[PDB]
């Protein structure tokens, strides 16, 4: 046995292209649409819960994931690749930051760590690149609210608002017309639902849409009282009912 | 670990990777070595395709391995740094364990052995570098000049050149260099080294580097003006 | 591509057979064994007149009682010589005696097939190992990159090998003197060499019980060349 | 064809070509004969030279006082396998104060050769071996193929033109098996057997190599003027 | 195409062609069988006599594992020996930790997982043997057959090699005509017959019969070779049936 | 605490003649004030006309002799059945002993 | 086995070139142009962001200009992810040196170290090289202000003015024309922006498509200050030089 | 080894080291130089357990000489002293620490200032105008505390050193066989052949 | 075209080796079904013993992973047993490390992560199996979680796997469209097994004897398989109404 693939599987072609990264980006293009919008007092990330079967319980499959109490993530592309990246992202936030500094990492540095993991899968021996693009929304004390995109290459960019996957080109155009620097969080959620409706074919409701926010601190979700400085997680996943309420005022 | 055999024999008994490493040397800038009666001179070409260069900080072509030995090269620049570093480490290791500085022949044998090792080790390619190693042994006044190449073979030379258009300057040296009476002085040795490079270089401005090594760790690099005076005198005699 | 340790349909290792082709391109080396000693001689073959020919080292001492000549990719021989010298001296450490020539040759040949995917390829050099011990007397061995070694009364390796071997076939007899062997190596080297044989482009050496392994001076060889010319002109 | 690049690849008919190519190296090798009675076991080997100035390559190797073999094919591979047998014979003596059974020696060689036929990177052994020995169950003769197959036999031969000697032994089976307490007559039968594989060349003093082991006979090799008696 | 050049590669069918090529090596080998009886198992194998120079009864093919398990195989003999060596290591470590001798179903999975592991990577070749094995444990008699893919099942009777079809047909008759079961001594006789009947597929060269058995009553649940009079009695019964 | 060494007593004597040599030793083996054996051989024929006795801690003495006999066997294999001379054996034995410089064979050896 | 799928990233071509290094350089030639200009009283680093969007958050964005320590900075051309791996290694090397010798790392030593890492990927390991070319801008008390470049081959050279990435041929000609030795920082700032404005593939050069930085002794008395320009500050210098 | 002293004056650093080597009740040598030139303007004296001293000094020497060749530049005395300290602070938590105390005397050609560093085997570094290791400072510090000025000449520093040595020779029970004295200044390193 | 031999991306952004592993899943030609009751989770699978020489008791594609978790496999038996052995080891390790029984969904996720690695790392091939895990979880109640060679997994109200999965899936879909609940409203597991068999009969259009089926049942604190005689009693009750 032994892993005898100690050589790169991603290499430069004569034209300067890294084939496997381009092909990974193609897999991301086939994936279901997901988006992110940044407001003045929050960030929203959203995607469609594309259920593979009506017998399948789509609540058990979480496309939007908590990484830290103040950082959330959504993706487009290959689901299994995303799931393992979330596991690694959650762990690296502890091992390379929280266990050292006693606090959770700022969004940009956690993004930097995830990016590193994805870059290594693009150069290390005997592996293919991850077939996903991530959208990571978060908040921290000194940088405020932020939204980042991470691609299969490991490259990451900060966005005011963006979309990835199936109907990203149309969705990004829609967001350019609606976005401004004075948006409140509720306005951003409203725009997110409008943008997402264009890429969805079938049912459009709280059970087929997954949406989460980075906003105000939630002391009700903390699970304990007695420490003034601990005020609760800024990440919150919107319920099926909460989504439907905002679809009536749509 | 990556163990792949990159340097292997072909049906006609050739190791192509080693031979292709020689082609990288052929592409490299010209380097020349000439030993006089009491000195050795190392000449090096600088390609003038690169101007706006900062000549203060740009890596010089001739490298001191120790206070009494120097090394110049032709071929891949990045590869040469690895050989030079190893040679410098070995030079200090020899002083540390044997309480004498390396002989020029010993240092050459080490560098040549490293090059050879990279022609039959798994997962590595040969160095795309040929070197000229020159200097004087401790407490000796006999000039030393050696050459190495990617295959790992080495030998001593009265005068030698490597790199691009080395065939032409070697032709010049073969008819101009006399063994019975080598360049008696430093002037004669430098003049012959500059003359040989002028067959290939193009302009005699900032394209020629000269480094003189004398006995007892006396090593100095000539400046642009000093070399330019040689270039002037050579062509003025040529107009006849 | 294909494995480095692959057999051909004829039952030969491709890489070993290809290394043998590299050895055919090498400069000529000749060995002759007699009851008065073993003589080793080589073609230096300098690529240019500016190359100082005395730095060309194709004949090498392994121990006081064992010498060695090489042909092919000579850079590959350095680690083999190093191993041979270490093996010879280590045996002297462990057993307070000289090591048998055959045992030394066997130790060198054990390295040969240590290649795969250990070193990445076979050696591209053949060795003539000459020496003397108390048990089997004066001996000459031919060590190949296949790991095989044959003992020889006389042997030639390199570019002019088959032409030289045919000449050694006729000339060798069991009553040869050392002086006769010296001239015979010079004669055959002069025959197969491209350039004209002299003391600067050819080198002689021998191994005797009394004096051990000795590389001949250029002045000493020059006299043997002059002695050769006169005896050929004598008839 | 497309399935002979390495040892780790079966062909569509279930063949291992690298092993078959290794088997081919044995057929190119010089002939060697093995045969036994109830008291003794004999090896006879035709040595091969490079030319008239060269020596004749040794074919027989001693493994222990009671065991040894003859080779045909790549000699270095025989040196590796014989070194392994020497160690195993020696492990049996040092640990268990027990002379290694010839049958168990065959089983060990089989398993060592097999590992080289199933793994990537390595290669099969390119040599065939005839092992003889005398242990607690009497005289023994084994034939080793680098495919891994080991076979206990009354007599056999391997190498170039070995079919002639093998046919002779197949006829003589009833005669030479009965040669008990007579080493010289058993060797005669072996020398006569290997003679059926000769063409052009004949058995000379530095050409022939013989080895014997038996009841009160340690494994000994005969070369030079010691085999002139049997020419 | 090119899917059959490397082990562990799925073809567009979902097949591992290298494993299927290993089966061809098995089908090329000599015939071996297994028969499950009332309180044990019987194993038998065809040994081709390539030459008169082969010493009779010396080149033993059937192998014991621990003291209660017998193993026989068809195909590449060295591959079978390698598998039995592993089986012996697996049986030893089981007994070392758990004290009791390894149960047959437990042992079957140890081989199965090992053989299956040689279908997971291109750096290894699949096994070129089908192995028939079994014995007696606390829960009674068990007979198994294991293929190059790592696939194995329990069997009432089992057969592999060049004469497997002929053998299988004969085994199917015994299952039908004996629903209440077959005795150990009967199974030895029947095993001899089946090997002789299966020899029609290898009829060029003559052969040597080799039988072994584990039985609770006849061998105290230990693996033993059938020797001497009991072997000759089975050969006589077999020779009588073909004529 | 476990003491890996012991003392089995015994005494040996080697005398060199002009064309012969003798190696003598008593046959008694002991621990403390008890007798283990009245006849336990201590001097051995190691082959190549060499005799050897490693006196002191019997377990280390048996191991050393066993290893030297092994060294003689492999000297024949590796060097064409050459006879191991007494001076060569002596040098070989030094290296057997010094290989355990930091956990010695507790024996006094004579060949 | 696995050999079948190995691309062999560290081999020579018959012409004596390294395939992967040459192809990596081809990749880099499509990256946004980065320019470095060295003056007597400071160094300028200018670089062009690649086809941006209006929805990109520029003030928190960084793809071209990175800080290695207080004295040394780099401009990137190629794969950003690959560059960040190397940048973090270089930051660590600078801190190791400072811990060992209690002095800030000389610029060349840092450059040589990174270039040696790049070289290693071309000679052993069987991995693809880093598709990155750096421009190093730095200061130390030995050589003063220094500009270097390194590429995937691991070869590095010193410069008075230099460009990497797209349109370097055109850019280098323009720099070679207008550059003079007695030049100052304010003049070098103007030269860098003018060169980008002429070589750019975009229709017009704007603040949102640029990253800019200076290393000046224009810090209060004998010391060096790094200035990574903000979006508004890039907008002002574009108006000052008369481009927008 | 026994006594090593150091004093930094106006324009130079002076190092004085004992000449004796002792194994038990016997003086093996009376002319031992307990110093290594690390670079042309940096000298290191040393004292500690046998073997460790010379092995460490020569190891440091080789590293600094390697740096000099690689960069074609001489490290500042401060940079050298920091390199040495790290090697000793690394050594103290190793399986077998180097039992060596050192003084580093150098002339910084950039600042045109002499500099003296005292470093013990633990990796404890301190820059001083004058310093000593072992029992040396116990006898000499009172004289140095009294007589030392930072504007002293090299000749005045040598006279104060003679006084320190005279006190050692009177009150120390051990005979250290005098001292070898070396001066480090702008022009390099030289030995005072008469002391 | 080596992008089809190992798990690297094709130009279309596809992994062909993963897709071909899905095809190996149906090599056995067996259909499985899983449904949830109030207090239980039932899994049934077709049993086919083609050879008379086989011991039918040893022919099984249902595995008892732990006391609480059961697993049915769709795919070749060597890969099935490979997955089974690993799941048993993981479940045991989990209990030792974390002090409570591994939940069905957590084990499913773990095995799905292992499968994902085989789709990313070149030297490891995907297992050509679909794994359906069942239990009565102490927190989530009756549970069905299914894993595939892509590394995908999800929870189910009910599920079906095999060549004729679509026919079974639609049959189940139609039943739950009527009842408007996420489970079989039934007290005893015996009647839930009867429901499972009945709806497989209706979907496949074939009658079953006692030896044609294989049944696994998960209750609180234990998972167990039914014997042939237990299945016969189940078949009799179906026929009598
Ligand atoms: Cl996991
Ligand atoms: Mg101190
Ligand atoms: Mg894979």
Swiss-Prot record, chain B:
CDD domains the record matches: proteasome_alpha_type_7
Q: Which GO terms describe its cellular component?
A: mitochondrion; nuclear outer membrane-endoplasmic reticulum membrane network; nucleus; proteasome complex; proteasome core complex, alpha-subunit complex; proteasome storage granule
Would you indicate the residue range of the signal peptide? none
Its recorded name reads Proteasome subunit alpha type-4
Q: Note one Pfam family from the annotation.
A: Proteasome
Superkingdom of origin: Eukaryota
Give an example GO biological process.
proteasome-mediated ubiquitin-dependent protein catabolic process
Further information = Present with 16800 molecules/cell in log phase SD medium.
Keyword annotations for this protein, in alphabetical order, are: Cytoplasm, Nucleus, Phosphoprotein, Proteasome
Q: Which InterPro entries match?
A: Ntn_hydrolases_N, Proteasome_alpha, Proteasome_alpha-type, Proteasome_asu_N, Proteasome_bsu_CS, Proteasome_sua/b
What function is annotated for this protein? The proteasome degrades poly-ubiquitinated proteins in the cytoplasm and in the nucleus. It is essential for the regulated turnover of proteins and for the removal of misfolded proteins. The proteasome is a multicatalytic proteinase complex that is characterized by its ability to cleave peptides with Arg, Phe, Tyr, Leu, and Glu adjacent to the leaving group at neutral or slightly basic pH. It has an ATP-dependent proteolytic activity.
Q: What is its main location?
A: cytoplasm
Q: Which family does it belong to?
A: Belongs to the peptidase T1A family.
> At what positions is Phosphothreonine found?
58
Where is this protein found?
Answer: Cytoplasm; Nucleus
SMART domains linked: Proteasome_A_N
| Organism for this UniProt entry | Saccharomyces cerevisiae (strain ATCC 204508 / S288c) (Baker's yeast)
From Swiss-Prot, chain E:
**Compartment annotation:** Cytoplasm; Nucleus
Which keywords has UniProt assigned to this entry?
Acetylation, Cytoplasm, Nucleus, Proteasome
The Swiss-Prot or TrEMBL record annotates one GO molecular function as:
mRNA binding
Is Coiled coil included in the keywords of this UniProt record?
Answer: no
Question: What does the UniProt PTM comment say about this protein?
Answer: The alpha and beta forms are probably products of the same gene with different post-translational modifications.
- Principal localisation: cytoplasm
Asked if Acetylation is a keyword of the record, the answer is yes
Q: Name one GO cellular component term.
A: proteasome storage granule
Query: Its domain of life?
Result: Eukaryota
What's any GO biological process attached to this entry?
Answer: proteasomal ubiquitin-independent protein catabolic process
Fill in the misc note. Present with 12000 molecules/cell in log phase SD medium.
Family membership noted in the UniProt record: Belongs to the peptidase T1A family.
Q: What does this protein do?
A: The proteasome degrades poly-ubiquitinated proteins in the cytoplasm and in the nucleus. It is essential for the regulated turnover of proteins and for the removal of misfolded proteins. The proteasome is a multicatalytic proteinase complex that is characterized by its ability to cleave peptides with Arg, Phe, Tyr, Leu, and Glu adjacent to the leaving group at neutral or slightly basic pH. It has an ATP-dependent proteolytic activity.
Quaternary structure? The 26S proteasome consists of a 20S proteasome core and two 19S regulatory subunits. The 20S proteasome core is composed of 28 subunits that are arranged in four stacked rings, resulting in a barrel-shaped structure. The two end rings are each formed by seven alpha subunits, and the two central rings are each formed by seven beta subunits. The catalytic chamber with the active sites is on the inside of the barrel.
Curated annotation (Swiss-Prot), chain F:
The portions of this protein that span the membrane are none
In which family does this protein belong, per the annotation?
Belongs to the peptidase T1B family.
Subunit structure, per the record? Answer: The 26S proteasome consists of a 20S proteasome core and two 19S regulatory subunits. The 20S proteasome core is composed of 28 subunits that are arranged in four stacked rings, resulting in a barrel-shaped structure. The two end rings are each formed by seven alpha subunits, and the two central rings are each formed by seven beta subunits. The catalytic chamber with the active sites is on the inside of the barrel.
The protein in question is named Proteasome subunit beta type-6
Cleaved signal peptide residues: none
Superkingdom, taxonomy of origin: Eukaryota
Its function, per the record, reads: Non-catalytic component of the proteasome which degrades poly-ubiquitinated proteins in the cytoplasm and in the nucleus. It is essential for the regulated turnover of proteins and for the removal of misfolded proteins. The proteasome is a multicatalytic proteinase complex that is characterized by its ability to cleave peptides with Arg, Phe, Tyr, Leu, and Glu adjacent to the leaving group at neutral or slightly basic pH. It has an ATP-dependent proteolytic activity.
- Give the organism, scientific name: Saccharomyces cerevisiae (strain ATCC 204508 / S288c) (Baker's yeast)
Question: Where is the protein found, in the record's own terms?
Answer: Cytoplasm; Nucleus
Swiss-Prot record, chain G:
Q: Does the keyword NADP apply?
A: no
Task: List the PROSITE patterns.
Answer: PROTEASOME_ALPHA_1, PROTEASOME_ALPHA_2
Q: State its location(s).
A: Cytoplasm; Nucleus
Cross-referenced Pfam families, in alphabetical order? Proteasome, Proteasome_A_N
| Keyword Cytoplasm found | yes
Locate the cross-link: Glycyl lysine isopeptide (Lys-Gly) (interchain with G-Cter in ubiquitin).
99, 198, 230
Listed under GO cellular component are: cytosol; nucleus; proteasome complex; proteasome core complex, alpha-subunit complex; proteasome storage granule
| Organism domain of life | Eukaryota
Tell me which InterPro entries the record gives.
Answer: Ntn_hydrolases_N (IPR029055), Proteasome_alpha (IPR050115), Proteasome_alpha-type (IPR023332), Proteasome_asu_N (IPR000426), Proteasome_bsu_CS (IPR016050), Proteasome_sua/b (IPR001353)
User: Which terms under GO biological process does the entry name?
Assistant: proteasomal ubiquitin-independent protein catabolic process; proteasome core complex assembly; proteasome-mediated ubiquitin-dependent protein catabolic process
Q: What is its main location?
A: cytoplasm
- Coiled-coil spans in chain: none
Alphabetized UniProt keyword annotations:
Cytoplasm, Isopeptide bond, Nucleus, Proteasome, Ubl conjugation
Listed under subunit, the entry gives: The 26S proteasome consists of a 20S proteasome core and two 19S regulatory subunits. The 20S proteasome core is composed of 28 subunits that are arranged in four stacked rings, resulting in a barrel-shaped structure. The two end rings are each formed by seven alpha subunits, and the two central rings are each formed by seven beta subunits. The catalytic chamber with the active sites is on the inside of the barrel.
Extra remark: Present with 17100 molecules/cell in log phase SD medium.
Similarity comment text for this entry: Belongs to the peptidase T1A family.
This chain's protein is named Proteasome subunit alpha type-3
């Amino acid at each position: 046995m032994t892993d005898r693939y100690s050589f790169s599987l991603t290499t430069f072609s004569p034209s300067g292209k890294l084939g496997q990264i381009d092909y990974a980006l193609t897999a991301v293009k086939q994936g279901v649409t997901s988006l992110g919008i940044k407001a003045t007092n929050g960030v929203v990330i959203a995607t469609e819960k594309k259920s593979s079967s009506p017998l399948a319980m789509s609540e058990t499959l979480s496309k939007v994931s908590l990484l830290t109490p103040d950082i959330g993530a959504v993706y487009s592309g290959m689901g299994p690749d995303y799931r393992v990246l979330v596991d690694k992202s959650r762990k690296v936030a502890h091992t390379s930051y929280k266990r050292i500094y006693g606090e959770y990492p700022p969004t940009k540095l956690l993004v930097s760590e995830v990016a590193k993991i994805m870059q290594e899968a693009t150069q290390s021996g005997g592996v293919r690149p991850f077939g996903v693009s991530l959208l990571i929304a978060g908040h921290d004390e000194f940088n405020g609210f932020s939204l980042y995109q991470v691609d299969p290459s490991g490259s990451y960019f900060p966005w005011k608002a963006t979309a990835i996957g199936k109907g990203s080109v149309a969705a990004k155009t829609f967001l350019e017309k609606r976005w401004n620097d004075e948006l409140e969080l509720e306005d951003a959620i409203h725009i997110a639902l409008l943008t997402l409706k264009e890429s969805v074919e079938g049912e459009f409701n709280g059970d087929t849409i997954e949406l989460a926010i980075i906003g105000d601190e939630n002391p009700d979700l903390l699970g304990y009282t007695g420490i003034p400085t601990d005020k609760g997680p800024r990440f919150r996943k919107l319920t099926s009912q909460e989504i439907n309420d905002r679809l009536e005022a749509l | 670990g990556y163990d792949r055999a990159l340097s292997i024999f072909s049906p006609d008994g050739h190791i192509f990777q080693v031979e292709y490493a020689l082609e990288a040397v052929k592409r490299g800038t010209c380097a020349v070595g000439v030993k006089g009666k009491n000195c050795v001179v190392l000449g090096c070409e600088r390609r003038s395709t690169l101007k706006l260069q900062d000549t203060r900080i740009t890596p010089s072509k001739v490298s001191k391995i120790d206070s009494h030995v120097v090394l110049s090269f032709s071929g891949l620049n990045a590869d040469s740094r690895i050989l030079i570093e190893k040679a410098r480490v070995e030079a200090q290791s020899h002083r540390l364990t044997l309480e004498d500085p390396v002989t020029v022949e010993y240092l050459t044998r080490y560098v040549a052995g490293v090059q050879q090792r990279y022609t039959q080790s798994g997962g590595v390619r040969p160095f795309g570098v040929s070197t000229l190693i020159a200097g004087f042994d401790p407490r000796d006044d006999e000039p030393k000049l050696y050459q190495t190449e990617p295959s790992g073979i080495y030998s001593s030379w009265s005068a030698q050149t490597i790199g691009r258009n080395s065939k032409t300057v070697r032709e010049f040296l073969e008819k101009n260099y006399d063994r019975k009476e080598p360049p008696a002085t430093v002037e004669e040795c430098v003049k012959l080294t500059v003359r040989s490079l002028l067959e290939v270089v193009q302009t005699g401005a900032k394209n020629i580097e000269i480094t003189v090594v004398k006995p007892d760790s006396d090593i100095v690099a000539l400046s642009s003006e000093e070399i330019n005076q040689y270039v002037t005198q050579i062509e003025q005699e040529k107009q006849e | 591509d294909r494995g480095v340790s692959t057999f051909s349909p004829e039952g030969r290792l491709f890489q070993v057979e290809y290394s043998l082709e590299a050895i055919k391109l090498g400069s000529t080396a000749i060995g002759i064994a007699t009851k008065e000693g073993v003589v080793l001689g080589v073609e230096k073959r300098a690529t240019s007149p500016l190359l100082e020919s005395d730095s060309i080292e194709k004949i090498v001492e392994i121990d006081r009682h064992i010498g060695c000549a090489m042909s092919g990719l000579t850079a590959d021989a350095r680690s083999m010589i190093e191993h041979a010298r270490t093996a010879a001296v280590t045996h002297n450490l462990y057993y307070d005696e000289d090591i048998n020539v055959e045992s030394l040759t066997q130790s060198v040949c054990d390295l040969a097939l240590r290649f795969g995917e250990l070193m990445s390829r076979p050696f591209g050099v053949a060795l003539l190992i000459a020496g003397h011990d108390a048990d089997d007397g004066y001996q000459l061995f031919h060590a190949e990159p296949s790991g095989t070694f044959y003992r020889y009364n006389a042997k030639a390796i390199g570019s002019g090998s088959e032409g030289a071997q045919a000449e050694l076939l006729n000339e060798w007899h069991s009553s040869l003197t050392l002086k006769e062997a010296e001239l015979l190596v010079l004669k055959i080297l002069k025959q197969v060499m491209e350039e004209k044989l002299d003391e600067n482009n050819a080198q002689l050496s021998c191994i005797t019980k009394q004096d051990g392994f000795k590389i001949y001076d250029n002045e000493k060889t020059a006299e043997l060349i002059k002695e050769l010319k006169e005896k050929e002109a004598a008839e | 064809n497309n399935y002979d690049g390495d040892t780790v690849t079966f062909s569509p008919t279930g063949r291992l070509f690298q092993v078959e190519y290794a088997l081919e190296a044995i057929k190119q090798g010089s002939v060697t004969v093995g045969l036994r009675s109830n008291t003794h076991a004999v090896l006879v080997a035709l040595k091969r030279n490079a030319d008239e100035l060269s020596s004749y390559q040794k074919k027989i190797i001693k493994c222990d006082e009671h065991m040894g073999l003859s080779l045909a094919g790549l000699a270095p591979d025989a040196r590796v396998l014989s070194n392994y047998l020497r160690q195993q014979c020696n492990y049996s003596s040092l640990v268990f104060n027990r002379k290694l059974a010839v049958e168990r020696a065959g089983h060990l060689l089989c398993d060592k050769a097999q590992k080289n036929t199933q793994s990537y990177g390595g290669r099969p052994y390119g040599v065939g071996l005839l092992i003889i020995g005398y242990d607690k169950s009497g005289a023994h003769l084994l034939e080793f193929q680098p495919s891994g197959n080991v076979t206990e036999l009354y007599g056999t031969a391997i190498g170039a033109r070995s079919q002639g000697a093998k046919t002779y032994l197949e006829r003589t089976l009833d005669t030479f098996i009965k040669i008990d307490g007579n080493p010289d007559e058993l060797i005669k039968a072996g020398v006569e057997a290997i003679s059926q594989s000769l063409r052009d060349e004949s058995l000379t003093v530095d050409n022939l190599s013989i080895a014997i082991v038996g009841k009160d006979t340690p494994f000994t090799i005969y070369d030079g003027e010691a085999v002139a008696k049997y020419i | 195409t090119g899917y059959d050049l490397s082990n562990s590669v799925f073809s567009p069918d979902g097949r591992n062609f290298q494993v299927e090529y290993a089966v061809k090596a098995v089908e090329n080998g000599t015939t071996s069988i297994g028969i499950k009886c009332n309180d044990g198992v019987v194993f038998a194998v065809e040994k081709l006599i390539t030459s008169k120079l082969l010493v009779p009864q010396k080149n033993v093919k059937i192998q014991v594992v621990d003291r209660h398990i017998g193993c026989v195989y068809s195909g590449l003999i060295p591959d079978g020996r390698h598998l039995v060596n592993r089986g012996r290591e697996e049986a030893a470590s089981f007994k070392k930790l758990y004290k009791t001798p390894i149960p047959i179903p437990a042992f079957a999975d140890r081989l199965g997982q090992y053989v299956q592991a040689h279908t997971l990577y291109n750096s290894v070749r699949p096994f070129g043997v089908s192995t028939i094995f079994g014995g007696v444990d606390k829960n009674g008699a068990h007979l198994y057959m294991l293929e190059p893919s790592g696939s194995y099942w329990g069997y009432k009777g089992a057969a592999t090699g060049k004469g497997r079809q002929s053998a299988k047909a004969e085994l199917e008759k015994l299952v039908d005509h004996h629903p209440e079961g077959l005795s150990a001594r009967e199974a030895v006789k029947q095993a001899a017959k089946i090997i002789y009947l299966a020899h029609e597929d290898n009829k060029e060269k003559d052969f040597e019969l080799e039988i072994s058995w584990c039985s609770l009553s006849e061998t105290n649940g230990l693996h033993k070779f059938v020797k001497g009079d009991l072997l000759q009695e089975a050969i006589d019964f077999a020779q009588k049936e073909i004529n | 605490q476990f003491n890996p060494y012991g003392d089995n007593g015994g005494t040996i004597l080697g005398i060199a003649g002009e064309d012969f040599a003798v190696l003598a030793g008593d046959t008694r083996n002991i621990t403390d004030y008890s007798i283990n054996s009245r006849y336990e051989p201590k001097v051995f024929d190691c082959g190549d006309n060499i005799v050897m006795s490693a006196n002191g801690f019997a377990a280390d003495g048996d191991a050393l002799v066993k290893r030297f006999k092994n060294s003689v066997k492999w000297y024949h294999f590796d060097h064409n059945d050459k006879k191991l001379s007494i001076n060569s054996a002596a040098r070989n034995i030094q290296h057997l002993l010094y290989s355990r410089r930091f956990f010695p064979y507790y024996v006094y050896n004579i060949i | 086995g696995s050999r079948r799928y190995d691309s062999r990233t560290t081999i020579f071509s018959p012409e004596g070139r390294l395939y992967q290094v040459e192809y990596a350089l081809e990749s880099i030639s499509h990256a946004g142009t980065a320019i470095g200009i060295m003056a007597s009283d400071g160094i300028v680093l200018a670089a062009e962001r690649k086809v941006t969007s209006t929805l990109l958050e520029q003030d928190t964005s960084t793809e071209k200009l990175y800080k290695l320590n207080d004295k040394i900075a780099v401009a990137v051309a190629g794969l950003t992810a690959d560059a960040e791996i190397l940048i973090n290694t270089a930051r660590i090397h600078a801190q190791n040196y400072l811990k060992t010798y209690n002095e800030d790392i000389p610029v060349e030593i840092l450059v040589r170290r990174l270039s040696d890492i790049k070289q290693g990927y071309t000679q052993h390991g069987g991995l693809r090289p880093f598709g990155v070319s750096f421009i190093y801008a730095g200061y130390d008390d030995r050589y003063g202000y220094q500009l270097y470049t390194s590429n995937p081959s691991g070869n590095y050279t010193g410069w008075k003015a230099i460009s990497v990435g797209a349109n370097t041929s055109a850019a280098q000609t323009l720099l070679q024309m207008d550059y003079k030795d007695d030049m100052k920082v304010d003049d070098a700032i103007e030269l860098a922006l003018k060169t980008l404005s002429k070589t750019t593939d975009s229709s017009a050069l704007t603040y949102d498509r640029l990253e800019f930085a200076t290393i000046r002794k224009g810090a209060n008395d004998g010391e060096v200050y790094q200035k990574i320009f903000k979006p508004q500050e890039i907008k002002d210098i574009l108006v000052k030089t008369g481009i927008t | 080894m026994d006594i090593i002293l150091g004093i930094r004056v106006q324009d130079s650093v002076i190092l004085a080291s004992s000449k004796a080597v002792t194994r038990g009740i016997s003086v093996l040598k009376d002319s031992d130089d307990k110093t290594r030139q690390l670079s042309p303007h940096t000298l290191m004296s040393f004292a500690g357990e046998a073997g460790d001293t010379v092995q460490f000094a020569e190891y440091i020497q080789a590293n600094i000489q390697l740096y000099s060749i690689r960069e074609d530049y001489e490290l500042s005395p401060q940079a050298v002293s920091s390199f040495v300290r790290q090697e000793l602070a690394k050594s103290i938590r190793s399986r077998r620490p180097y039992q060596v105390n050192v003084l580093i005397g150098g002339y910084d050609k950039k600042k045109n200032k002499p500099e003296l560093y005292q470093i013990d085997y633990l990796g404890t570094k301190v820059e001083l105008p004058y310093g000593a290791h072992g029992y040396s400072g116990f006898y000499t510090f009172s004289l140095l505390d009294h007589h030392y000025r930072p504007d002293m000449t090299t000749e005045e520093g040598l006279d104060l050193l003679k006084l320190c040595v005279q006190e050692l020779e009177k009150r120390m029970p051990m005979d250290f066989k005098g001292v070898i004295v070396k001066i480090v200044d702008k022009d390099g390193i030289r030995q005072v052949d008469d002391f | 075209g080596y992008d089809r031999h190992i798990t690297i991306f094709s130009p279309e952004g596809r992994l062909y080796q993963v897709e071909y592993a899905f095809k190996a899943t149906n090599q056995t030609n067996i259909n499985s079904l899983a449904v949830r009751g109030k207090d239980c989770t039932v899994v049934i699978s077709q049993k086919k013993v083609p050879d008379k020489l086989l011991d039918p008791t040893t022919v099984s594609y249902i595995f008892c992973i732990s006391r609480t978790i059961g697993m049915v496999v769709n795919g070749p038996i060597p890969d099935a047993r490979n997955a089974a052995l690993r799941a048993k080891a993981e479940a045991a390790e989990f209990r030792y490390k974390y002090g409570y029984d591994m939940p069905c969904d957590v084990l499913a996720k773990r095995m799905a992560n292992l499968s994902q690695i085989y789709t990313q790392r070149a030297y490891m091939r995907p297992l050509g199996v679909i794994l359906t895990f069942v239990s009565v979880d102490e927190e989530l109640g009756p549970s069905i979680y299914k894993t595939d060679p892509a590394g995908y997994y999800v929870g189910y109200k009910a599920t079906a796997t095999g060549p004729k999965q679509q026919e079974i899936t639609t049959n189940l879909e139609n039943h739950f469209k009527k009842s408007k609940i996420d489970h079989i409203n039934e007290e005893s597991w015996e009647k839930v097994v009867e429901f499972a068999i009945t709806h497989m009969i209706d979907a496949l259009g074939t009658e079953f004897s006692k030896n044609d089926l294989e049944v696994g049942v998960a209750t609180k604190d234990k998972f167990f398989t039914l014997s042939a005689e237990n299945i016969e009693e189940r078949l009799v009750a179906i026929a009598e109404q």
